[PDB]
Amino acid sequence: MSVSAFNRRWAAVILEALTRHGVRHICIAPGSRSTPLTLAAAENSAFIHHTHFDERGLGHLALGLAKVSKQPVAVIVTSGTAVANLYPALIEAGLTGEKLILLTADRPPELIDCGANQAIRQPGMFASHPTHSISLPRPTQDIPARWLVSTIDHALGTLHAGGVHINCPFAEPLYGEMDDTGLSWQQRLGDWWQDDKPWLREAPRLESEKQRDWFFWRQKRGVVVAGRMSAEEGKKVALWAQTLGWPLIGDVLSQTGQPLPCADLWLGNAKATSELQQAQIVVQLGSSLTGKRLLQWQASCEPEEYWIVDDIEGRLDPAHHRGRRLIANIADWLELHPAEKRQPWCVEIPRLAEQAMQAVIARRDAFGEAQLAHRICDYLPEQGQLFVGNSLVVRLIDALSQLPAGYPVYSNRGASGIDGLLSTAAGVQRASGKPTLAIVGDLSALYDLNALALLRQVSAPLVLIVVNNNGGQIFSLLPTPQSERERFYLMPQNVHFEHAAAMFELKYHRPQNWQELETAFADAWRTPTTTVIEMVVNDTDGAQTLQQLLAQVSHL
Amino acid sequence: MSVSAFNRRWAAVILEALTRHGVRHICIAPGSRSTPLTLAAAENSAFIHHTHFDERGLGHLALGLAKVSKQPVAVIVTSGTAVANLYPALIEAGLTGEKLILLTADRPPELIDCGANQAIRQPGMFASHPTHSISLPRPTQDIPARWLVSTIDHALGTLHAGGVHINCPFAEPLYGEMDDTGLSWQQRLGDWWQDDKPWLREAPRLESEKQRDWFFWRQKRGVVVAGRMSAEEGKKVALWAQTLGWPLIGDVLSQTGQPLPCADLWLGNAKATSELQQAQIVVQLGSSLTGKRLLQWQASCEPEEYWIVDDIEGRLDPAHHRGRRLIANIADWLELHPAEKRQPWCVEIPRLAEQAMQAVIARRDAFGEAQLAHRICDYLPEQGQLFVGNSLVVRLIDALSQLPAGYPVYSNRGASGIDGLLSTAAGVQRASGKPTLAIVGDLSALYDLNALALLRQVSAPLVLIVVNNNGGQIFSLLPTPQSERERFYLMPQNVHFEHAAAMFELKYHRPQNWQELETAFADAWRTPTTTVIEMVVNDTDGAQTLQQLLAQVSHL
C-alpha cells in the first residue's frame, strides 16, 4: 500500500543480491533520494560502510578499495551532479579493471525533463565507460523480485572487469515507518534470502587458450617486459625471466625487483638498443608502462612477434605490433607457459644497467625530488605498500630507484588522473590494513585536498609525502614554450600544506634535510594515523636531474 | 610537413571563430595534449584568460562567468579524466542555460582503445547533456579551414542555451618551432581574418508568439509566481503584477522585492490556499522554484490554465498542469502582454503575509543561521550582488527574508549541486566586478574547498559566509530516520575553516555575535579581497526554527 515501504523492499533486494557476488565494502555519500538504497545498505550486516561528502573522492575511495581487495565495491549517491562526480573513478576503473558497482539514485520518470529540482537525464550518462549499464524501471510489485535479482546477477556474474552503472529511480514518499508492503512480494524468492549464492548463476570465464607453440618460441632470443601486475606476479615473472635467460625490463609498477634497473636511462644508450634488436620475440606481462625511453623502445622495436599477457581485455600495445594479445591471469599463464633453463643471450645491457644505477648513486646526496625518488627504497614501511602518485614522481621513481621484488605498488595509471590520488590512497590503505607510503606532487594534493578528511581514518600509519616544487613541473620536463610555461603550464599556486594538515588534525613535518626526513618517518610510523610530510624543493631540479642523468648514461 | 605547426593552425581557427560569437572569457587548465588549443588561446588578444588546477572547479568558474555575462564562455582542458570533471558544470549549464564552450583535447583515433596513457573514449562521453556536440576529425589540410569554422559557426550560432562539447584530437609532435605549414590553408579564408563576423551567419531565433487571448485572461482572477530571472526582470514583474492586482509570490531568486514575503510560511495556512483556489489562471515567470510550500501549492492548485514564461526550453512545470509553456525573454514577454490596471482581488493573503513576517521578526535576536537568513537584506553590499548557496541557506532566505527588488541574486539551482559553489562564486564576482556576498554551508565549503585558490583573486571585495552547523543539516529538516541520521545523512565532519583561509592568505573571522559580525562585514568591504567569515551555529537550531515558524503561521 505504502510507496515508501516498497521502495525500501525493492532496494533491499538490490543490495542483498550484491552480497552474493563478493561486495563487502559500500561507499556512501549523503542525499535524500538515495534513502531506500542507503537504509537497506546500512541495515545489511554483510557490508563495511565508508562515507565521504565529495562524490568524486567517494568514487576514488571505492576505486582504492577495489584496487587492493580485487573485489567489487558498491557506491551509493543521490541524483544529480553527485552522479556526474563518479565519472573519473568510473573511467579509471574502465581502463585498469576495478569493479565499481555504482548504485545511483534517480528521480522517477514523471519528474524528468520538467524543471524539477535536482532531476537530470541519468541513464546512459557514462556512455560506454561502464562494462554494463542497468537502467532500472520505476519500482512496482507488478515486476517480480526474481526479475530484479536476475538482472543484477547477470551484470555482476558476467562482470569480467570495470564498473557497473545501476540507475535506481525512486518516487516519493521516501520516508515513513515500514509497512508490510512488498513483503509477500519479497517472499516470492523463498529461501534465497538465507542462501549464500546468486539467484541466477551466470559466470562464464574469459580466457585465452594456452599458446601451443611456446616451447618453440622460448628457444629464441627473447625479451621480457613487465608492466603493472600483482606483487606475487612480479616475483614469479622475475624468476621466469631469469630462467629463460631473457633480459627483464621491469616497470616501477611490476614489483619484479627490476634486475636491470634504470631502464629509462640505459635504454637511451645505442649499445643497449643495438643489442635489443637481436630480439626475435618480446613477451610483455602487464601494461600501462611508465617510462618514456621504454615506450619509445616498445614503439621502435621490430621482433617477429610481440606478445602482451594481461587479465584486462582489449589491445594494450599502442605501437600495434604483429603478434598476440593474451587474456589471462599472469600467474596462471606463467604455469601454462613455463620457462626452461637456458643460457642468457644479453652481455652488454647488464653492464650498462649497473653503470646507470652507479651514476644515479653519485648524485644521491642533494636534497631533491629526484634523489628522494632514488632513495624511496630506504623509506618503504615494513610489510606495507606504496601508492605512487602521477606526473614526475612515478617517472622519477621508475628511472632512479630499484624497488624490492614483491613489494606491493599501487597507482592510478589507467588514465593517470591527478584528480583522485589522496582519496584513492585512503581506499588502498583501508582495504589491506597495511602501513602505507603515498607520494604525490603539490598540484595533485591540492586537486583532491578535501580527501585529507578521509585520511583522518586509517587502520595503520599512512605517510603522505607532498612533493612541493611549486607547480606541475612535468611541464618543465616537456619542451613547453618558455614564454607561456609558467602561467599556462606550471600554474604555481604558491602554497604550503601545514594549514591543510592542521585543519584536519593530521601530524605534519616539513623536513629541510635527510636527517629531519628520517626523523619525521620514525615519528610517523608509530601510530595508526596519517602524517603529512611536505618536502619543499626547487621547481626544475627534478626535471633537470633526470635529463642530465639521461645524457650522461647515453654516452657510456 | 610539420604536424605540430599545423596542429596550432587548426586550433587557431577554432579559437578565432569563437571570438565572433562573443566569447571573451576562456578558462584554462594545464596539459600537454591541450597545447595547440592553449597556445592559440594565449596568443589571441581577444580573450580574458583564467586558470585553475581543478578541472571541475574550472567548469564552475566558467559557469559563474557565463551566469553573469550571459555570453558564451570557453573552457580548455587536456585529455583524460580532466574532461570528465567538466560534467558537473556542463549538466548545470544544460538546465539553467549558461553557454559553456568546452574545448576538450584528445588523443588521435590511432591511440584510442589501445592502452595508451591518458587516452579514453571521449566523443559522446557527456551523452545528451550538451546542447551540441562536435567531434572533430583528425586534423588535416585535406579538410578546408572553411568547413572547420562553419561547423563551429553552426554550433555557436544556433546555440539557444546550454553547453557545446567540442572534442579536439591532436597527434604528436605537439611542440616544435612554428612552421609555415597550414598558413596558405588558413589564408583560404581571405579577409575573414580581419572581420568581426562569423564565417557562416546562422542564428535563427526561438520564441513564442503573442498570446492572442491575453486580453481575456488578464481580466480573470490570476496569480503571479516569480521564479529565477534577471535583476531588471524582477522589478518589471513586480510592477506588472501590482498593476494587475494579482498576488505576487516571489521566489528568493526573483528579485521582485517579494511584496508578500515568507510565502513558504503563509502558504501553509489553509486560509491562503482556500483564497488561492479562486485563481482561474496562474502566470509563472522564470522557474526553479525554491520553497517546499510553494512547490506543494503548485502541485495542488487547479486553475483553468497554468502558464510558464521563461527563456529556457522544455516543460518547467513538474506538476504537469493544463496550460501553456511560453519561450521568450521575460522582459520582452511582458511588453508583448502588457498589464491592465485592475483592482486586487486577494484580501486574506496580504493579511497573512504581514503576520508571517512579524512572526519571523519576533525571533530575529538569536545568533542562528535562520536569523542570519532573515537579516541578510540588511547586510547586502552596496551596488553588489548575492551568491546564494544550496541546501538550507537558499531555503531559509526564501522563507524568512525579504530581498530588495532588482538587487542581483545568483545561484546554482538547476540541479542544486553542492559541488561547485565556491568556484562559481569566483566567476560570478569576476564577471561583474561587483562587491559580492556569497553564503554556503560547511559541506559545500569542504566540497569545493580548493576553490579558495581562486578567491585570492577578485576585483572587488568578496565576503564568503561559511555557515558551519557541522554537517548536512537539511537532513534534520527532512523526516530522516534518527538512528542512521548522523552517520549516513548528516555526516558531520567536525572542522572549522580558519586554517583553510590561512592556507590561501585570506582574512578570516569567527564572530560570536551580531556586533562582531557587522564588525567583520565593515572591514571586509574595504579591500578588493576575499574575506572568509565562519558562522558556527548549533546543528539543528536552523531547521527547527523553520519548522516552528511553519507551525505558527499555519495556525493563524
Ligand SMILES: Cc1ncc(C[n+]2c([C@@H](O)CCC(=O)O)sc(CCOP(=O)(O)OP(=O)(O)O)c2C)c(N)n1
Ligand atoms: C584530472 C587531471 N587534470 C590534468 C592532468 C594533466 N596533468 C598531468 C598529466 O600529464 C599526467 C602525466 C602522467 O602521469 O601520465 S601532470 C599535471 C601537473 C601535476 O602537478 P603536480 O601534482 O604538482 O606534480 P609535478 O608535475 O611532479 O610537479 C597535469 C595537470 C591530469 N593528468 N589529470
Ligand SMILES: Cc1ncc(C[n+]2c([C@@H](O)CCC(=O)O)sc(CCOP(=O)(O)OP(=O)(O)O)c2C)c(N)n1
Ligand atoms: C554534488 C552533490 N552531492 C550531494 C548533494 C545532495 N545534498 C543536498 C541536496 O538536497 C540539495 C538540495 C537543494 O539545494 O535543493 S544538500 C546536502 C548537504 C549540504 O550540507 P551543507 O553545505 O553543510 O549545508 P546545510 O544542509 O544547510 O547544512 C547534500 C549532500 C547535492 N545536491 N550535490
Ligand SMILES: [Mn+2]
Ligand atoms: Mn608539483
Ligand SMILES: [Mn+2]
Ligand atoms: Mn551544514
